Design a protein around this ligand. Structure first.
Ligand SMILES: CCCCCCCC/C=C/CCCCCCCC(=O)O[C@@H](COC(=O)CCCCCCCCCCCCCCC)COP(=O)([O-])OCC[N+](C)(C)C
Ligand SMILES: CCCCCCCC/C=C\CCCCCCCC(=O)O[C@@H](COC(=O)CCCCCCCCCCCCCCC)COP(=O)([O-])OCC[N+](C)(C)C
Ligand SMILES: CCCCCCCC/C=C\CCCCCCCC(=O)O[C@@H](COC(=O)CCCCCCCCCCCCCCC)COP(=O)([O-])OCC[N+](C)(C)C
Ligand SMILES: CCCCCCCCCCCC(=O)OC[C@H](COP(=O)(O)OCC[N+](C)(C)C)OC(=O)CCCCCCCCCCC
Ligand SMILES: CCCCCCCCCCCC(=O)OC[C@H](COP(=O)(O)OCC[N+](C)(C)C)OC(=O)CCCCCCCCCCC
Ligand SMILES: CCCCCCCCCCCC(=O)OC[C@H](COP(=O)(O)OCC[N+](C)(C)C)OC(=O)CCCCCCCCCCC
Ligand SMILES: CCCCCCCCCCCC(=O)OC[C@H](COP(=O)(O)OCC[N+](C)(C)C)OC(=O)CCCCCCCCCCC
Lengths: 622, 223, 79
C-alpha cells in the first residue's frame, strides 16, 4: 500500500516527498527481520503485475525535475546494494516483454539520463521482444529492431548512437528474433525523401563505417536475405541506390566500398562497380529479386540505378537480342503454318500439320509450367505479369483439343481451330517488346484498354440493351405477311439495328410498323444523342487524359517487361554457353580482393577536385 | 479544420481540446478525436449540416477533414455498403420484372405484375416525400442534388398511370410503359455510386453533358 | 477534352460527396436498436471527469521528433 504512494510521487515529480518516502521505506527495512532486505525492497519498488519498476515510471513521465529523481533512486539502490537487480529489470507481459529503463530513456530522447543509466551499469543488449515491438500489422506497434542501438538509430538521434557505438560492452552484430541485425532493421524502416528525410541512409553508413567489416553486411536474415537483398525485396529505392554505388575515399576503409574509380584523368573517369551479388550468377540476386517482384510498384524506378541499367543493356546486346528475334521467327512460322493448314482445308511438304502439333505441345507444356511458377492466385497479377503466359497457353491448348476432336471424336473442330488462329495474331502483338518505339506503344494499349475502354463498354451496353428492348417492345405484330419493315421486330433484331447505327452502317429507316411514330423517333434520337454525341466523344477525351498521364512513365514500364524477357532467356541456356557471356572482369581491388566488377565511364565538368583514391595511376585502357 | 482537431498541450487547459494523443511511442501515435457533436447522433450535427448544405460550394473540400473522413468510411464499412448493394438488387429485379411483363405482352409465377405495381407505389411515395423535403424551388438545385430523386419519381409515376390507363380507361397504355422501361435503365446509371472508378466516371458524364453537349445541340439544331 | 482536364482534378471529391449523401440517407432509415448496434467511437477517460465518446486515428510522423508529454496513456499499444 506504500508502493502506490511511491509510484504517484515519482510520477508527479515531487523531490522532497520522494526523499521522505524512501527514508520511511529504509526504516521499514530496519524495523523488520523478514527474509531478504534488498530482495523484499526490490519487491516493494516493483509493480509485480506488469513488472514496471519505479525507475521506468520515473522515465515514462518527463517531470522537469526528473533527473534528480533518477539520481535519488539510483543512490537508494546503491545504498541497499541492488543496482543491477534494479536497473536491469524488464516487463513481463506479452505486450512489452523485454523493455528496460534504457529503452524508455532512449526513445524519450533523454540524451542526459541515458548516459547516467549506462554508466550506472545498464544492459546495452535489451532485446525488447514483446508483441508491440514486434507487431503483426503496421499500426499498433513499431518494430525498431529490438535493441537500444537499433532504437537510437531508428529514432534519428546520432548522439546516443555514437555513445552506444564507442563502447566495449555493446554487441554491434546481435541478431534479434526476426534474424535482423542493425542493418536489416535500418533497411526495414527506411522510407522515401518526402516522408522522412535521408537520416536512415546517414545512420546506415555511420554504423557500417564505425564498425568496419563485411561481416555486418553479409549476415543472413531468417529468410536468407542479406541487408541488400532485403532493400530490393521490399523496394527501398533510396537506400538501395546508396548501397549499390557506395565509395569510401579513405585508405583504411577503401576496402568496404562497391564502386572504385580507376583512372579519372581530367573530367573523364572510368569507375567500376562491384557486381558480386547484383548479377544473376547465384540464387536470389538483386536483378532476379527486383524483376520478379510482383508485390511492389517501385520496380521500374529501381531498374534505372547504375549497375542494373548497364547490366540489362549488356545482356540485350550479347545473347538476349538474338534469342528474342529467333523466338519471334519460330512463332511467326508456327502461326503461318497453322493458318495455311486451316484455310486450305480439304473440302510432300505437308508435314506442317505435325509441326503445328509438335510446337503446340511444346508451347502448352512450357507455358503451363510458367503459370504454376508465377502463382496467379493473388489478385491483378494475371493482368500484371502473366497475361501473355495465359494467352499463349490458351491458344496452344486450343490447337491441341482441335486435333483431339478432329480424329478422336469427329465433331465440330473449327471453333477451336479458328479461335486459335485469331488468338495467334494477337500474340504477335506480344512480340513488339523488342523495339522501343513500337514496344512502348503497346504499353499504352494496355493502360487505355483497362482504364477507358472497359468503363465505356459497360455504359454503352447498358444503353444499347435498354433502348433495344424498349424500341423492340414498341413494335406491333410482325406484318400482314409475317415479314415486312420488321427491322426493330424482336429484341435481338432491334439490338442489331442500334449497333449498326453506332458503327455508321446501313440505312436508318424510321417507317416501321409502329403504333407511335413520334415516340419511336424520340427514343431513337435520344439513343443517337447519348452514344454518337456524348459517349464516343467523351471516350476520345478521357483517352487523351490517360495518354498524357502514362506518357511520362511508359519507357520505364517497357524497359521493365523487356527486362523480364531478358531474365527469362538467361535461365534457359546451358552453363557452358552461360559462362561464355559474363558481364565483368576480375580486378585487383585491394591488397587481396577480387570482386569481378562492371565498368562505367563518365564525364563531369563541375566538381574539379584533385584526384586521389584512383585504382590505377596511369590512365586509359591497357 | 482548426476547431475539429484542436489540441491544448497544457495541463490546466488540456480539458478543452478536441483531439487527444493516447500513446505515441516513437513515430507511431494513436490520437483519438472528440466526436461529440460531429456525428449524426443528435439533431443538426456537423455531418448532416455539411452534407445537406445545398447553399455552398465548399462541401467536397470540407469532407476531407480528419474526423469526418474516417467517419464516413467507417459508415461505408459497417452498414451502408450492404444496404446499397441490397437496394441495387431490389431495383434491378424491379426493372427486369417490368421489362419482361412489357415485352412479353399477350398479343403461376406471374405475380410479377402486382410486384411491379407494389414497388412502383413504394418508390413513387418515397421519392415524392424526398422532393418535398429537398425544396427544389431554388434555381439549379434540381440538377444539383435531387436529379435522381426526380427521375425515380417520374419513372414510378409513369408505371402507375400506365396501370391506371390499362384497365380503368382502356387507352394507349404503351407510351407510358415503354417510357418507363427506358428510364429505368438510365437509373441503373445512378447505382454506379458504389464504386470509385465506375462512379467518378459517371460524374464527368454530368459535367460534360451540362457544359459541352447542350451548347453543341443548340448551335447544331440551328443549322 | 478541355472540360475533362479541368474536372479531373476534383472529381473524386465530388463523388465522395454524393456517396456521403447516400450514406447519410441510409443512416436515417434503419431503426434505433439496429442504429445503436453500429456506433463509431468509444467512451474514453479524457480528463478527471470527462467522457467524450471519441473516434481513433493512428498516424506515423518521421519529422518532428519531440519528447512526448500530454499522452493519455503512458504504456503504449492497444490494450
Ligand atoms: C462502339 C461499339 C463498340 C462495340 C459494342 C458491342 C456491343 C455488343 C453488340 C452486340 C449486338 C450484335 C447482334 C446481336 C444479335 C444478333 C442476332 C443473333 O445472332 O441472335 C442470336 C444470339 O447472338 C448473339 O448472342 C450474338 C453473339 C454473341 C454476343 C456478341 C459478342 C459479345 C461481346 C464480345 C466482346 C469480346 C471482347 C474481347 C475479348 C477478348 C440468337 O438467335 P436465336 O434467337 O437463337 O435465333 C432463333 C432463330 N434462328 C435460329 C432461325 C436464327
Ligand atoms: C485463372 C483464371 C483466369 C480467367 C481469365 C478469364 C478471362 C479474362 C480476360 C478478360 C479480358 C479483359 C481485357 C484484357 C486486356 C489486355 C490488354 C493487353 O495486354 O493488351 C495488349 C495488346 O493486345 C490487345 O490489346 C489484344 C487483346 C485481344 C486479343 C485478341 C482476342 C481475339 C479473340 C480470341 C498489350 O499488352 P502489353 O501491355 O504489351 O503487355 C501485357 C502483358 N504483361 C502484363 C505481361 C506486360
Ligand atoms: C420542378 C419542375 C422540373 C421540370 C424539369 C423538366 C425537365 C428538365 C430536364 C432536362 C434535361 C437536361 C439534361 C440533364 C442532364 C443530366 C446529367 C446527369 O445527371 O447524367 C447522369 C448520367 O445519366 C445520363 O446522362 C442519362 C440522361 C438521360 C436519361 C435517359 C432518358 C431516356 C428517355 C426518357 C450522371 O449523373 P451523376 O453526376 O452521376 O449524378 C447526378 C445526380 N446528382 C445531382 C444528385 C449528383
Ligand atoms: C521497317 C522499320 C524497321 C525498324 C522498326 C523500329 C523503328 C523504331 C526503333 C526504335 C528504337 C529501337 O528499337 O532500338 C533498337 C532496339 C532497342 O535498343 P536499345 O539499346 O534497348 O534502346 O534494339 C535492337 O537492336 C532491336 C532488336 C529486335 C530483335 C527482335 C525483333 C522482333 C520483331 C517483332 C515484330 C513484330
Ligand atoms: C454482355 C453481352 C453484351 C453483348 C450483347 C449480347 C446480347 C445481344 C442480344 C441477344 C438476344 C438473344 O439472342 O436473345 C434475347 C432473348 C430472346 O430473344 P427473342 O425476343 O426471342 O428474339 C429472338 C429474335 N430472333 C429469333 C430473330 C433471333 O431475351 C429477350 O428477348 C428478353 C429481352 C428482355 C430482357 C433483357 C433486357 C436487358 C436489359 C439490359 C441489361 C443490362
Ligand atoms: C420535348 C419533351 C418530350 C418528352 C418526351 C415525350 C414523348 C415523345 C412524344 C410522344 C407523343 C405520343 O405519341 O404520345 C405521348 C403520350 C400521350 O399521347 P396522347 O396525348 O394521349 O395522344 C397523342 C396523339 N393525339 C393527341 C393526336 C391523340 O404520352 C403519355 O402517355 C405521357 C408521357 C409523359 C412523359 C413524361 C416524361 C418524359 C421523360 C423524357
Ligand atoms: C467485374 C469487375 C468488378 C469490379 C468493378 C469495379 C472495379 C474498380 C474498383 C474501384 C474501387 C472500388 O470500387 O472500391 C471498392 C468500393 C469503394 O471502397 P472505398 O474504400 O470507398 O474506396 O467499396 C466496395 O466495397 C464496393 C461495394 C459496392 C456495393 C454496391 C454495388 C453496386 C453495383 C452497381 C452496378 C451498376
Amino acid at each position: 500500500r506504500l508502493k502506490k504512494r511511491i509510484f504517484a510521487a515519482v510520477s508527479e515529480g515531487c523531490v522532497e516527498e520522494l526523499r521522505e518516502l524512501l527514508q520511511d521505506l529504509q526504516d521499514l527495512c530496519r524495523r523488520r527481520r523478514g527474509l531478504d532486505v534488498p530482495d523484499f525492497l526490490m519487491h516493494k519498488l516493483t509493480a509485480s503485475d506488469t513488472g514496471k519498476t519505479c525507475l521506468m515510471k520515473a522515465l515514462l513521465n518527463i517531470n522537469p525535475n526528473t533527473k534528480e529523481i533518477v539520481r535519488i533512486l539510483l543512490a537508494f539502490a546503491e545504498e541497499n546494494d541492488i543496482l543491477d537487480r534494479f536497473i536491469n529489470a524488464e516487463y513481463t507481459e506479452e505486450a512489452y516483454e523485454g523493455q528496460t529503463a534504457l529503452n524508455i530513456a532512449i526513445e524519450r530522447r533523454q540524451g542526459d539520463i541515458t548516459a547516467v543509466l549506462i554508466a550506472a551499469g545498464a544492459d546495452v543488449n535489451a532485446h525488447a521482444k514483446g508483441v508491440f515491438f514486434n507487431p503483426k500489422y503496421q499500426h499498433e506497434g513499431f518494430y525498431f529492431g529490438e535493441t537500444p542501438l537499433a532504437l537510437a538509430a531508428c529514432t534519428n538521434q546520432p548522439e546516443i548512437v555514437q555513445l552506444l557505438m564507442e563502447n566495449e560492452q555493446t554487441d554491434i552484430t546481435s541478431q534479434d528474433s526476426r534474424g535482423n541485425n542493425i542493418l536489416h532493421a535500418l533497411v526495414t524502416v527506411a522510407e522515401d525523401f518526402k516522408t522522412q528525410n535521408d537520416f536512415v541512409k546517414r545512420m546506415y553508413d555511420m554504423i557500417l563505417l564505425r564498425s568496419g567489416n563485411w561481416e555486418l553486411e553479409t549476415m543472413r536474415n531468417n529468410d536468407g536475405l542479406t541487408p541488400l537483398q532485403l532493400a530490393a525485396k521490399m523496394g527501398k529505392a533510396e537506400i538501395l541506390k546508396y548501397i549499390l554505388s557506395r565509395e569510401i575515399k579513405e585508405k583504411p576503409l577503401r576496402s568496404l566500398s562497391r564502386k572504385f574509380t580507376d583512372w579519372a584523368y581530367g573530367p573523364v573517369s572510368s569507375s567500376l562497380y562491384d557486381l558480386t551479388n547484383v548479377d544473376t550468377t547465384t540464387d536470389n540476386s538483386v536483378l532476379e529479386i527486383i524483376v520478379y517482384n510482383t508485390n511492389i510498384d517501385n520496380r521500374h524506378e529501381m531498374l534505372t540505378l547504375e549497375p542494373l541499367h548497364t547490366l540489362l543493356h549488356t545482356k540485350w546486346k550479347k545473347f538476349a537480342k538474338y534469342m528474342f528475334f529467333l523466338s519471334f521467327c519460330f512463332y511467326f512460322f508456327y502461326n503461318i503454318t497453322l493458318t495455311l493448314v486451316s484455310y486450305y482445308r480439304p473440302r510432300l511438304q505437308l508435314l506442317g500439320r505435325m509441326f503445328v502439333l509438335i510446337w503446340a505441345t511444346c508451347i502448352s507444356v512450357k507455358e503451363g509450367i510458367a503459370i504454376f511458377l508465377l502463382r496467379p492466385s493473388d489478385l491483378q497479377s494475371i493482368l500484371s505479369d502473366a497475361w501473355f503466359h495465359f494467352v499463349f497457353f490458351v491458344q496452344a491448348v486450343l490447337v491441341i483439343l482441335s486435333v483431339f476432336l478432329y480424329l478422336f471424336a469427329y465433331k465440330e473442330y473449327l471453333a477451336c481451330l479458328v479461335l486459335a488462329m485469331a488468338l495467334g495474331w494477337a500474340n504477335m502483338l506480344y512480340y513488339t517488346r523488342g523495339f522501343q518505339s513500337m514496344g512502348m506503344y503497346s504499353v499504352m494499349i494496355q493502360k487505355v484498354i483497362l482504364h477507358d475502354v472497359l468503363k465505356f463498354l459497360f455504359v454503352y451496353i447498358l444503353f444499347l440493351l435498354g433502348f433495344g428492348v424498349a424500341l423492340a417492345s414498341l413494335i406491333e405484330k410482325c406484318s400482314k405477311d409475317k415479314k415486312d419493315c420488321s427491322s426493330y421486330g424482336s429484341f435481338s433484331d432491334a439490338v442489331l439495328e442500334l449497333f449498326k447505327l453506332t458503327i455508321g452502317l446501313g440505312d436508318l429507316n424510321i417507317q416501321q410498323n409502329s403504333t407511335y411514330p413520334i415516340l419511336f423517333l424520340f427514343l431513337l434520337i435520344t439513343y443517337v444523342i447519348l452514344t454518337f454525341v456524348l459517349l464516343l466523344n467523351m471516350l476520345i477525351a478521357l483517352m487523351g487524359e490517360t495518354v498524357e498521364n502514362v506518357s511520362k512513365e511508359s519507357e520505364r514500364i517497357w524497359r521493365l517487361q523487356r527486362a523480364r524477357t531478358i531474365l527469362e532467356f538467361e535461365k534457359m541456356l546451358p552453363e557452358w554457353l552461360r559462362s561464355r557471356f559474363r558481364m565483368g572482369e576480375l580486378c585487383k581491388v585491394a591488397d587481396e580482393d577480387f570482386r569481378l566488377c562492371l565498368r562505367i565511364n563518365e564525364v563531369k565538368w563541375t566538381e574539379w577536385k584533385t584526384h586521389v583514391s584512383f585504382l590505377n595511376e596511369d590512365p586509359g585502357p591497357i
